[PDB]
Amino acid sequence: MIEADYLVIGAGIAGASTGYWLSAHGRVVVLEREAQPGYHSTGRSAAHYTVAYGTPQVRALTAASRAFFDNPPAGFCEHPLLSPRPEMVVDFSDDPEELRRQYESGKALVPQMRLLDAEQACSIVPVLRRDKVFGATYDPTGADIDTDALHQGYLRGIRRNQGQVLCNHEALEIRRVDGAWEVRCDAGSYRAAVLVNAAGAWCDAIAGLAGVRPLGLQPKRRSAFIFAPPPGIDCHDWPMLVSLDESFFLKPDAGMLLGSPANADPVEAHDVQPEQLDIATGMYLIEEATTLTIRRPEHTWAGLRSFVADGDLVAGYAANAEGFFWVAAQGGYGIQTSAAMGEASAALIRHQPLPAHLREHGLDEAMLSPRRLSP
Ligand SMILES: Cc1cc2c(cc1C)N(C[C@H](O)[C@H](O)[C@H](O)COP(=O)(O)OP(=O)(O)OC[C@H]1O[C@@H](n3cnc4c(N)ncnc43)[C@H](O)[C@@H]1O)c1[nH]c(=O)[nH]c(=O)c1N2
């Protein structure tokens, strides 16, 4: 039996970020089922940062994370965590009212957000079919996140603070014993006053082991693929391109193009594989919007974006289950919100007020709590 102050289940971006901030204050042990911490959703994302995405809570958590991403502590990473990648949202269906509403809402959080005419959008991504383009919004402040460096920075930070990150440690049994939570894995047993449930799409399964009422988390499959651009076009500086109705996105990645139908098909938590229909739909939508020809994609994959009913993230203690803390419902936002989520969850776990910089973005206990869910 190994004792800790905080026992975290899951070493994806959620558990790693929460563990990182906790590790400054006590002994953290993170238990991870897989052989590597980023095998599931955290290693399968499109890795983009944009404030104007998701619910108001998500936008606040994303905005509040930028300070850390732009100024992490010395030794956290070797190179910047963010690289410039503006986002251009293109109207392909001639909906000027919706385009205006997205522009106005985005500009309220991003003063530099711009409204583009069709010619401006096509100047930026010249493969757009001009007769299908009706205008766009443009966020000059978007960025790509180096997920590997961020995730490894969190994990290394735990270990440098005398915490432990234990892979091949699937939590199999969980029990409240003598005022603490005890977790049995095949390799070893662990005890801590606080159990942090950061198990991604499996958070409700972890609650099931513990006898704690689950949240109603719904994992949803999203597939993506990479394909080669035609030999004559340099697309490496293109923005992240999204359609106005979120039917697809397309962004440069490692000399290739990364596409997705931006799907969200509800599934059980599992090691999710891409579906042929997903890939074909994404290819069709990109070929409908652009002059690109997509041959058989060179690599395809899928990951899970897991949501509760209201689309907001969850960080808070369970009602009626002492010491059981949810870090859940990251949706499609877990990487871009991870700095604010990690710092806020650590404060809440420790029963401390949220730091002032988070409060200035409108973050508080109530907006994050699982107890807002009803019934
Ligand atoms: C295609 C695509 C594209 C994007 C995105 C997703 C997808 C699929 N996302 C979303 C992002 O991927 C998602 O929000 C986070 O990776 C969720 O991180 P978690 O740590 O919650 O889950 P994650 O699945 O990474 O970690 C949970 C961990 O818990 C472990 N676990 C489960 N059960 C266990 C047990 N019994 N014992 C021990 N360990 C256990 C798992 O093995 C797993 O490693 C995204 N986000 C974003 O911010 N920007 C973006 O651009 C995108 N884009």
One DSSP character per residue, 16-66 reads: HHHHHHHTTTS-EEEE-SSSSTTSSGGGSS--EE-SSSSSHHHHHHHHHHH
Classify the C-alpha dihedral 13-286-108-119 as positive or negative.
positive
The three-class DSSP label of residue 243 is strand
Measure the CA–CA gap between 227 and 233, rounded to whole angstroms.
14
CATH 3.30.9.10 for domain 83-141+217-308: yes
| Beta carbons within 8 Å of 277's beta carbon, 6+ residues apart | none
The three-class DSSP label of residue 254 is coil
Edge-first strand order for the sheet with 143-145 is 48-49, 143-145, 82-84
Find out whether the beta carbon of 41 lies less than 6 Å from any atom of ligand 1: yes
* Residue ID of nearest Cα to ligand 1 atom 47: 333
What length does the chain have? 375
Domain ranges in the chain are 1-82+142-216+309-375, 83-141+217-308
Tokens linked to 348: 């809440």
Q: Beta-carbon neighbour count of residue 120 at 10 Å?
A: 15
Measure the CA–CA gap between 90 and 245, rounded to whole angstroms.
9
Domain boundaries 1-82+142-216+309-375, CATH class: alpha beta
Mutation to probe ligand 1, out of 17, 39, 42, 82 (largest number of atoms < 8 A from CB):
42
Find out whether the beta carbon of 200 lies less than 6 Å from any atom of ligand 1: yes
- Phi–psi pair at 334, nearest 5 degrees: -65, -35
CB 223 within 8 A of CB 216: no
- CB crowding 333-358: b at 16 or more within 10 Å, else e: bbbbbbbbbbbbbbbbbeeeebbeeb
Q: Beta-carbon neighbour count of residue 277 at 10 Å?
A: 12
* Residue ID of nearest Cα to ligand 1 atom 50: 47
Measure the CA–CA gap between 65 and 101, rounded to whole angstroms.
25
CB 301 within 8 A of CB 44: yes
| CA end-to-end distance (rounded Å), the chain | 37
Q: Beta-carbon neighbour count of residue 367 at 10 Å?
A: 18
Strands (E), 254-308: 256-260, 265-266, 299-307
Helix (H) or strand (E) holding 153: helix 147-160
| Resolution in Å, one decimal place | 1.3
Elucidated via:
X-ray
Find out whether the beta carbon of 332 lies less than 6 Å from any atom of ligand 1: yes
How much distance in Å is there from the Cα of 42 to the middle of ligand 1?
4
For residue 275, give the nearest of 200, 241, 225, 218 by alpha carbon: 225
The three-class DSSP label of residue 194 is strand
